[PDB]
Amino acid sequence: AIFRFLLFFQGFHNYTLNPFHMMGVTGVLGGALLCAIHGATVQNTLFRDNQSKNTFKGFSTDQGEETYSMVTANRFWSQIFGIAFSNKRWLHFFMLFVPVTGLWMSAIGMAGLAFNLRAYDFVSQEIRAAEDPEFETFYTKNILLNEGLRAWLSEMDQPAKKFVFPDEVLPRGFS
Amino acid sequence: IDVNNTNIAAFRKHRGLYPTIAGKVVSNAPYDSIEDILDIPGLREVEKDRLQKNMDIFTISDPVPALVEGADRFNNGVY
Amino acid sequence: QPVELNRTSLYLGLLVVFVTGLLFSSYFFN
Amino acid sequence: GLPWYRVHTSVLNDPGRLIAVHIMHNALCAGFAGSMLLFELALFDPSDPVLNPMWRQGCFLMPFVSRLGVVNSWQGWSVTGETFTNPGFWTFETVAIAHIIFSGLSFLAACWHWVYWDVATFFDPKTDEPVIDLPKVFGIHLTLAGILCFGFGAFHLTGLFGPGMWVSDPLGLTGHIQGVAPEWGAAGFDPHNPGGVVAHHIALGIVAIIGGLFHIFVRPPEYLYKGLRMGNIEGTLASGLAVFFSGAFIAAGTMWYGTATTPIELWGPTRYQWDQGFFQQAISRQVKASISDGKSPSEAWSEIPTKLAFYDYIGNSPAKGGLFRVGRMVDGDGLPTGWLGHPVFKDGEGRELTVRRMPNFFENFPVVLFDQDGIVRADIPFRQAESKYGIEQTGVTVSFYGGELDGQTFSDPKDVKKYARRAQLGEPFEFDRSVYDSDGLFRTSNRGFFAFFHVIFGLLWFFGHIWHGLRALFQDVFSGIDP
Amino acid sequence: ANLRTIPLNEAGDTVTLSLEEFTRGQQKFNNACAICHLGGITKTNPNVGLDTESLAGAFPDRNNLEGLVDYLHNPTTYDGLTEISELHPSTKSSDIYPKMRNLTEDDLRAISGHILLMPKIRGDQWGAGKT
Amino acid sequence: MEAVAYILIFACIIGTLFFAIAFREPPKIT
Amino acid sequence: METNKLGFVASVLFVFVPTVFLLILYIQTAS
Amino acid sequence: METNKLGFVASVLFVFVPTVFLLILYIQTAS
Amino acid sequence: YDDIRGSGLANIRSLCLQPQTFLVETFRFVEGKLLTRSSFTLDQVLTFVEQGGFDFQPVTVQNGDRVPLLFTVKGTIRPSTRFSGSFDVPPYRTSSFIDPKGRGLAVGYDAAVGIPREAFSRQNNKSFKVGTGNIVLQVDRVNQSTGEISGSFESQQPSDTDFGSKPAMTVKILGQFYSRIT
Ligand code: CLA
Ligand code: CLA
């Protein structure tokens, strides 16, 4: 049902084109990036606080000292990525801030799709493609795919509406 | 069905015609006479007589250039 | 206390402005 | 106060400066109301309220101004339509100029309160620290809100000493301003009832006067003073932000659904009047009543008002614009020049055909013509190689009743293929897209834009409510927990 | 019920099918014939479908159970000019197509009876697919 | 003039990226 | 290209009205 | 009025590009 | 084939036609550049009637404007003898082509369904006309031991109009051909 909802939102709403959803995707993908990169950075800047090769026993709950070198991690990411965190508290606030604000921005995009206020189309390109039957962009091929989804789903998506589409008004791509 | 604008897939509709009769009525085009399909320039007697039964639907109306631009009657491309 | 904005916050603010503007420019132009 | 996102907390312990910074928000709000109405009127076309109402023209503040009583301008015209010569004093301009003058006065008063922060009102007598008594101030404020509510609903909306309010018929054709008696029964809770609005404001004015008097003479309990952090002004902000975001959702919902407060002469029709075919059934009912009154089909169909036909345009559904299709509705389909009349499609067999109208969901829709049986009889094809249906293959003719094409019949494939496209968009209309450089893509009304903005406002004020409630309760641990 | 009853021959005699027999034929449709007749049409040629209107309009009329079994005994054209048992699987020609070498007369009868006892169950869901 | 806005904003991202690597505030150990 | 005319002036004030604010805040911090 | 189109955008950058400079300089002096 | 696989040795019996230059008469005949790698060999085709074979080759040549021309010819021997004739150029693409907006002639929309007929109707209703091309075939080298003659041509045929959207221009084509009269 969620998968139908996702494809319905593309075909009827063009939701990938919605910029608030693009920030949602950016926030969620960056949240996953931050989760992975912070875990691996901590795990690879650990201190030698044990004797065994299993470094998971090099940490006690009661200890008040950092279990990983923030200095070595800052050095590594400064010389790999050009920037690095130096503030641990800011790092963990960023790890909070990134997926939460992404998820909020996607919620703003859905609030817009409640009133059908859609980033469906770019008016300049729907114009140009219609005055020029040679102007093809990936966007025009997304608009065509959306029409294909819309006409080929809606007759069984909403069966209260009783949409009757004959086989020869359904947009085919010339099979 | 017209015999100078119509494809092979709409020669299915007739009771027993596919594929040689339809593959030969289309291969030579245009036909001026409606009854010019019955001369059969290279077809045999089993084709000739069977086509001679089926003369109540054939036509010579108009070969549209959008419908004949090199194997558009044979495989238009609509499956 | 007076307001601050350190260098890192300036760079972060500049990128968030610049990337957000690049994102929304395509839709302001429509 | 040092991080950039904390700077306005410099007035958090300075109530004179707090009043200053509030009076400046007032000056900005009223200056925006005045300037926006001036801009809404420089761009307004008052020539006709039938085909170019304010909701087609992107008027944001004008409906709210005219919903209470201010419908006519000093130029003569009126959004109801009549031009005169003595439009009272409360016109569209006087309102914007009053807000501009208020904005100037409030800027000066905020300057005074910024400079003279140290007045002995904001510091208690016993010590000299800045304080404001939130229960007492709340009671005074609640009482003031109570008198303003009671008065507005009992003297401005009733019309006893006020203009009244906009009322309309269900079809939304006789929109005018008159004072509305209160409705105290169950009928007062009908959303499309203005006496309910009048009675609500009356009853809640008495309620807020009593509560404000109770919140001025009765001090809060010692458990609820520390429980709700009643000494913390931040806690007051959190509860006010709660009221603010839940009102936004209620305001947005009642704008999208339509109540007596948002009539369709000002904000236009709702998407739910197109979803159920509200004006379509209204016109069909009126037409058949005239048909059974011994009138011809063309004669009955030409008594349908252009304003009643225009409501059946799907271009007037507020659920049909786009997020970045910015601007006014006539920036899209264009300026309407007239109603083409009811199209009646007839096949080659002489059967009544109906074009399936398109829903609010669809950006574009297959044009398919049904009949009384509901079986497909013609359509505008796509594959057009096994297309047994089709306009020219079936010979569908369109004949118009009413409007500009009254009596005319068209049988050309191009013409029937065009008017079957305009028939699925509702009642067909002629659009001139040269006056406003209209691009052809539908735009939502002021109803849609207001509803969507105030939903975004509800969502961010939900978060702001949470942020300040959590900050008010967890004030002791904001800097950190404990060593 | 009446779905079991199908045309047997061109003489005219509606023959009823057992539910188990029909299911047994349905399975064998999906092991030796669904390679390219899955759905209702033929993948090799998208014009010769296994539909009622096509099979009744075949020459000879092959919308009959005995007609379909006799087709499987001899692959011909839609008009029946050349008996090309080599481009098609054929009950006699097991060397070109080894799929029916294990199928008996009952197997051919059941697979031919299941093709003609769907179309009033489905309708426009077997003929050419639901678009 | 719509490409000009995009190229100018992209140049602003690139300038911020250079200045936030090259002229970054030094992280001092305590 | 039938693009919004003010879409240029919307793009550049969207991205430099905040930017100068940040630079103001940074410069007054650095001095 | 057949006026220069860019005369608007010339007028406003002529008078606020220096202005923000002054405010930057003032604000960093005041802080 | 492995010797010619990757080389390109392809690019009355089989009559192959190998252009080496494409002068388009822009508003004089200027010669562009071949943007379709090497697929211009009209191959395996007193009066001569046209036959099967690759009697069409769509080649896009290139100001900075792509011109997609459908190079085609549909419709005693000594070192001077010429078979001058004319041919019917079909449209570049057949009527089952669809533009970026969903519209087409055999299959497709009949109008722009992006907006909701107007001044778009020149691109909406697509046409499928036919053009004529004059070709003059020169015979230069004749070897009767194999039974075959070869020479050069000049052909003037129109380019594509995008189903009636833009005025096509005439292209001059020169190159050697070789056929086996039998
Ligand atoms: C007998 C006199 C009388 C009469 C006739 C009315 C009549 C009316 N009152 Mg009422 N009122 C009265 C006395 C009276 N009142 C008194 C004495 C008080 C003091 C308590 C009130 C306090 C009051 C309030 C607070 C409200 C009314 C409202 C109304 C209107 C409700 C109709 C409507 O639009 O729904 C609108 C609102 C609702 C049907 C309730 C919505 C509440 C939602 C469901 C809460 C949850 C939403 C959540 C916060 C956000 C959603 C997020 C997301 C999940 C969507 C109606 C005309 C409502 C109104 O004016 O709406 C504009 C309204 O909110 N009255
Ligand atoms: C009545 C509404 C209201 C009020 C009075 C406040 C007041 C306050 N908030 Mg707050 N907040 C609110 C709503 C409100 N908030 C909402 C709705 C949200 C969610 C979006 C937030 C989320 C929030 C956070 C996360 C924080 C605050 C903080 C603060 C305090 C510091 C002030 C500040 O941030 O200045 C600084 C702001 C700037 C210097 C520039 C901000 C520029 C904004 C983003 C653009 C301006 C847009 C436009 C001009 C404003 C018009 C809005 C329009 C929609 C009406 C202050 C007491 C801070 C705090 O807790 O104090 C210690 C804090 O960190 N708020």
Ligand SMILES: CCCCCCCCCCCCCCCC(=O)OC[C@H](CO[C@@H]1O[C@H](CS(=O)(=O)O)[C@@H](O)[C@H](O)[C@H]1O)OC(=O)CCCCCCCCCCCCCCC
């Ligand atoms: C391409 C056009 C778009 C532009 C996009 C670029 C936006 C940049 C925004 C500002 C970012 C820099 C903030 C301050 C950083 C810092 O303090 O550096 C200080 C450094 C020294 O490093 C430092 O020096 C300091 C001591 S001192 O400076 O040497 O005295 C020392 O404390 C410190 O550790 C050391 O790192 O040098 C500077 O003075 C930088 C200030 C230059 C002004 C910004 C660049 C302006 C654009 C230049 C190109 C013109 C474009 C023309 C076309 C329009």
Ligand code: HEM
């Ligand atoms: C037991 C298995 C099969 C059965 C019962 C079967 C049945 C049939 C029948 C009855 C027809 C004629 C229908 C008509 O044209 O009206 C036919 C045609 C056809 N079959 Fe199948 N088939 C089987 C296996 C296959 C397979 C595996 C293929 C895959 C290559 C295939 C490809 C075709 C083709 C291409 C045609 C059309 C040929 C023509 O027009 O003569 N068949 N089949």
Ligand SMILES: CC1=C(/C=C/C(C)=C/C=C/C(C)=C/C=C/C=C(C)/C=C/C=C(C)/C=C/C2=C(C)CCCC2(C)C)C(C)(C)CCC1
């Ligand atoms: C001095 C004075 C005066 C005068 C006054 C005046 C003249 C005024 C005014 C005023 C004004 C003239 C105002 C205003 C306003 C406006 C506003 C305040 C607004 C706004 C806005 C906003 C807020 C927005 C934002 C945004 C954008 C841009 C878009 C979207 C996004 C954002 C949100 C960012 C007088 C004499 C009387 C008195 C004395 C004093």
